[PDB]
Amino acid sequence: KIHYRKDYKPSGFIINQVTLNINIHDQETIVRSVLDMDISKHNVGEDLVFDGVGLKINEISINNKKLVEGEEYTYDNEFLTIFSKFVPKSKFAFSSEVIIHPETNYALTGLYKSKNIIVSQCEATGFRRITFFIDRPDMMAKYDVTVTADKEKYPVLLSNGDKVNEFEIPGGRHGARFNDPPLKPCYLFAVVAGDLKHLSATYITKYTKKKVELYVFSEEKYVSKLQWALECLKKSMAFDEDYFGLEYDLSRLNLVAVSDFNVGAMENKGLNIFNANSLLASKKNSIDFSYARILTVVGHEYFHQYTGNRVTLRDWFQLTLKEGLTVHRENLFSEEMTKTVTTRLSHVDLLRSVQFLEDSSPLSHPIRPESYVSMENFYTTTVYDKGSEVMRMYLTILGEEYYKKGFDIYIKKNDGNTATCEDFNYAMEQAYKMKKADNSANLNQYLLWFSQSGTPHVSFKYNYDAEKKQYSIHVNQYTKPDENQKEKKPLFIPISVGLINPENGKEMISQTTLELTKESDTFVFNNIAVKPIPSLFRGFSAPVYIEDQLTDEERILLLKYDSDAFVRYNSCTNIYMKQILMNYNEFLKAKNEKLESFQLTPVNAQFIDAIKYLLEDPHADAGFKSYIVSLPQDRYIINFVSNLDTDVLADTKEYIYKQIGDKLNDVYYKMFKSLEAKADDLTYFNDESHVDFDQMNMRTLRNTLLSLLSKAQYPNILNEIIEHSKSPYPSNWLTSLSVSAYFDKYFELYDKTYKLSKDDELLLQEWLKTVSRSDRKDIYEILKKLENEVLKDSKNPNDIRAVYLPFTNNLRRFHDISGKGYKLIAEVITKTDKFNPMVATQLCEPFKLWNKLDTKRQELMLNEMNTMLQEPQISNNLKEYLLRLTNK
Ligand SMILES: CC(C)(C)OC(=O)N[C@H](C(=O)NO)c1ccc(-c2cc(F)c(F)c(F)c2)cc1
Numbered sequence: 001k002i003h004y005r006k007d008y009k010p011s012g013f014i015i016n017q018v019t020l021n022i023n024i025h026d027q028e029t030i031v032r033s034v035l036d037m038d039i040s041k042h043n044v045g046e047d048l049v050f051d052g053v054g055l056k057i058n059e060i061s062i063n064n065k066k067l068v069e070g071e072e073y074t075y076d077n078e079f080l081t082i083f084s085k086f087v088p089k090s091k092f093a094f095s096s097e098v099i100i101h102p103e104t105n106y107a108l109t110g111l112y113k114s115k116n117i118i119v120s121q122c123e124a125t126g127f128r129r130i131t132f133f134i135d136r137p138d139m140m141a142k143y144d145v146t147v148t149a150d151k152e153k154y155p156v157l158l159s160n161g162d163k164v165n166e167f168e169i170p171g172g173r174h175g176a177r178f179n180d181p182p183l184k185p186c187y188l189f190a191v192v193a194g195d196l197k198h199l200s201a202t203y204i205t206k207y208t209k210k211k212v213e214l215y216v217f218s219e220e221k222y223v224s225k226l227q228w229a230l231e232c233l234k235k236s237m238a239f240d241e242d243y244f245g246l247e248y249d250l251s252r253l254n255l256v257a258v259s260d261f262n263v264g265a266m267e268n269k270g271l272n273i274f275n276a277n278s279l280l281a282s283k284k285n286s287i288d289f290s291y292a293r294i295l296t297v298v299g300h301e302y303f304h305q306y307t308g309n310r311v312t313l314r315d316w317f318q319l320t321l322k323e324g325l326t327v328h329r330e331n332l333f334s335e336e337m338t339k340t341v342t343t344r345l346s347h348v349d350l351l352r353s354v355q356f357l358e359d360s361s362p363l364s365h366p367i368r369p370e371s372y373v374s375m376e377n378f379y380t381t382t383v384y385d386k387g388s389e390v391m392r393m394y395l396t397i398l399g400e401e402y403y404k405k406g407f408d409i410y411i412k413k414n415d416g417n418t419a420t421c422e423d424f425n426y427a428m429e430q431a432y433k434m435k436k437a438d439n440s441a442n443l444n445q446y447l448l449w450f451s452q453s454g455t456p457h458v459s460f461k462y463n464y465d466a467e468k469k470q471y472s473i474h475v476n477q478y479t480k481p482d483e484n485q486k487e488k489k490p491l492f493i494p495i496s497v498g499l500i501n502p503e504n505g506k507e508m509i510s511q512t513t514l515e516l517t518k519e520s521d522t523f524v525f526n527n528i529a530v531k532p533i534p535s536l537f538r539g540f541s542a543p544v545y546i547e548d549q550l551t552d553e554e555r556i557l558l559l560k561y562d563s564d565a566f567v568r569y570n571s572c573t574n575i576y577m578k579q580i581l582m583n584y585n586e587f588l589k590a591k592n593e594k595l596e597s598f599q600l601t602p603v604n605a606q607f608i609d610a611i612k613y614l615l616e617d618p619h620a621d622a623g624f625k626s627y628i629v630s631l632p633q634d635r636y637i638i639n640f641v642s643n644l645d646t647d648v649l650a651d652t653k654e655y656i657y658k659q660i661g662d663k664l665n666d667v668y669y670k671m672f673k674s675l676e677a678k679a680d681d682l683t684y685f686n687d688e689s690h691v692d693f694d695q696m697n698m699r700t701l702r703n704t705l706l707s708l709l710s711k712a713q714y715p716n717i718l719n720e721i722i723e724h725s726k727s728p729y730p731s732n733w734l735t736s737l738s739v740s741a742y743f744d745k746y747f748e749l750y751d752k753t754y755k756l757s758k759d760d761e762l763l764l765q766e767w768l769k770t771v772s773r774s775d776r777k778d779i780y781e782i783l784k785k786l787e788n789e790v791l792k793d794s795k796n797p798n799d800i801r802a803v804y805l806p807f808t809n810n811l812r813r814f815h816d817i818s819g820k821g822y823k824l825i826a827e828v829i830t831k832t833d834k835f836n837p838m839v840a841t842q843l844c845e846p847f848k849l850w851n852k853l854d855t856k857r858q859e860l861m862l863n864e865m866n867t868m869l870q871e872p873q874i875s876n877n878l879k880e881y882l883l884r885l886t887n888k
Pocket residue numbers: 108109121123124125126262263264265266267296297300301304323327375376377379384838
């Protein structure tokens with residue numbers, strides 16, 4: 001069935017109260033539910049239809065009168081239909097008892113068992129897997145929930161709201177009752193049972209001085225990995241108070257880590273549930289990336305308490321209103337917490353690779369789609385990450401003061417209610433009116449950001465009149481037509497700009513945001529004393545393809561002297577791309593024409609000199625440095641090449657890296673050595689509350705340089721690699737494994753690092769990733785070893801994603817012209833689809849670019865997708881996804 005956004009209509013029913021009784025046993029879980037219901041003003045005498053998937057019915061009733069199957073109701077394992085003649089015309093009670101079995105629920109939706117923890121996941125439509133309901137977010141109800149279980153196995157019982165009773169039960173059981181009076185949609189319901197251990201703290205809110213209890217839970221083995229999470233939660237609460245003036249409204253907040261989770265985490269009210277890899281960390285057992293990851297995910301689920309939980313969604317088409325907005329809120333938070341420019345750079349880096357790829361694929365959709373089939377496939381980088389950039393542009397346009405005003409208007413007006421993207425734009429518009437000082441102003445055009453798919457292209461031409469001291473920036477925007485709009489309308493594009501004096505590097509104008517609202521415009525500046533170099537889209541101010549039309553000379557000057565990290569980083573990116581495209585074509589022609597000899601355009605020497613200049617600058621940022629010595633991501637590059645031959649691209653990258661290494665390897669080595677003291681400083685190694693994002697960026701830089709030096713076979717670098725493997729930091733000794741791929745000691749470090757990793761569940765997964773991404777010619781043989789010795793038949797999504805996804809980024813090997821890499825991943829997708837369709841669809845990610853490759857590889861990928869589509873037992877999720885991806 002296809003759901004269309006235009007078809008939204010309120011229910012003919014109301015659910016006012018939910019009373020749950022969840023009885024957990026070894027071989028089954030019994031769920032008793034009483035729904036206190038009413039007839040709505042929209043009711044037209046229709047049948048009462050509940051969602052209910054995979055439920056085993058013991059009995060159902062209306063007003064304590066048992067209903068009988070066939071006569072008064074039908075159930076088809078998806079919908080419970082109660083014929084209208086048996087539906088009361090006023091307030092009534094529907095009750096039911098069903099059996100479900102979390103033990104065998106490997107799809108990790110609804111109620112399921114993760115190791116020895118019983119946990120729910122109800123977003124988007126998982127509650128219907130637990131009991132009958134009108135499973136949609138505009139059905140707001142009160143919840144009274146009792147959980148019972150064997151006490152020895154499940155001593156900790158959690159649900160939403162206040163725990164209002166604890167009690168013993170004959171036969172070694174207990175129960176706990178939780179009452180949550182505020183209305184909520186069912187996707188925010190959660191329940192957890194297990195032998196959980198915790199850390200806790202008390203937080204006192206800023207304005208009302210309410211005491212909030214904070215609890216972070218895990219299995220006993222990993223309780224020592226809980227501290228950073230608790231710190232991140234405190235940080236999150238403070239930020240929402242300090243930036244947005246928003247306090248937590250409940251007595252208690254629980255964070256719970258489970259080993260089996262489809263995504264990073266879930267914002268269930270008062271009971272946030274996490275993939276263990278996004279909550280747990282220790283400096284001995286985690287790589288550096290875990291620390292920013294936990295900060296991000298804890299912050300994200302916390303900021304949902306307002307943007308998603310207190311202000312909720314009318315329908316699922318509004319998903320970006322809570323996800324784009326909460327990602328934006330988490331980005332503000334993380335940028336403030338890390339104080340490094342690489343935080344913003346890493347987001348943009350992700351958007352322009354992964355999200356830009358999606359938006360030019362057959363899967364392209366606006367951040368508010370017009371239709372869906374599978375809600376489990378709806379949670380896309382477009383909705384999230386382009387969503388966040390669309391939410392961030394409001395702040396760019398309004399500035400901090402008026403943005404905060406608009407945001408607070410949004411919260412005060414919609415608190416405790418459902419909302420739509422329009423409601424948010426409305427609130428922002430009010431601020432916009434105030435800022436520009438006339439109620440004539442509006443943001444009507446801004447709405448196109450929600451409805452129009454595809455990535456806009458923004459291009460530039462310049463003019464300078466030396467005599468007039470007059471400078472002009474001519475701007476053009478265009479979006480390519482696609483399956484969603486035949487004609488693309490001009491968007492409201494805010495362009496943050498500076499003008500750099502090339503002679504002294506100084507700023508020539510104050511902060512300026514150009515408001516491009518037409519297909520094209522000319523922006524003129526007077527009293528510009530000398531010809532500037534324009535600094536365009538500072539902070540990456542709009543989610544677009546920037547075509548700056550600058551010379552490499554200008555870009556080099558920006559890279560060295562501009563004030564904005566993104567524009568510096570983009571100027572470097574643009575220099576690299578021009579080189580890549582040129583060398584790519586040179587290699588391609590040599591291949592196509594089978595040339596015995598040919599020439600390659602060398603890398604710009606002044607560019608190499610600029611890299612050396614920045615690398616040697618003691619005051620420059622280590623994280624920024626690691627970006628400039630890295631070529632743009634493959635998935636960013638592919639946006640710019642038709643019929644991309646991945647082998648030719650691999651040769652192109654190789655040539656360009658070798659060119660730069662031949663000049664800078666001695667600089668690289670020197671820095672690798674000089675950075676060690678501060679990068680690997682052990683002073684705070686046993687203090688889990690002390691996280692230094694600069695220090696971690698130094699380690700990133702070292703590990704990046706070590707990688708470059710190892711590939712280059714720099715003289716005696718293997719010595720450094722071996723010493724690096726003795727480092728206490730997993731980022732370092734896991735790095736030592738992947739860079740040793742180019743030496744005969746690879747399998748020695750393989751075993752060494754495996755032994756270090758094997759007794760921590762999450763570290764072992766990082767080890768798996770490191771092996772998976774190792775640049776090995778025998779990588780297929782290595783993967784088979786992983787399968788037989790470590791992965792086996794694990795249904796843990798973390799294990800499966802760790803073993804295979806990094807490998808799919810191996811440009812040379814995954815895309816082997818035999819198609820064997822395509823064959824391998826499709827075998828994994830099909831296998832995984834039997835028990836977890838959501839994760840199987842995640843494992844399809846490599847195929848998203850299939851129609852962008854050379855015609856041979858297109859054919860190879862398409863063959864594997866058609867093979868998958870032909871599987872008799874294909875899930876709804878996977879079928880729908882592959883049908884859209886192959887334009888069927
Ligand atoms: C990495 C971030 C923090 C951005 O996102 C997540 O970790 N999780 C998503 C989110 O927005 N959390 O607040 C998230 C949460 C649940 C789902 C989700 C999970 C399921 F099991 C589904 F079946 C489903 F349809 C959606 C998808 C994404």
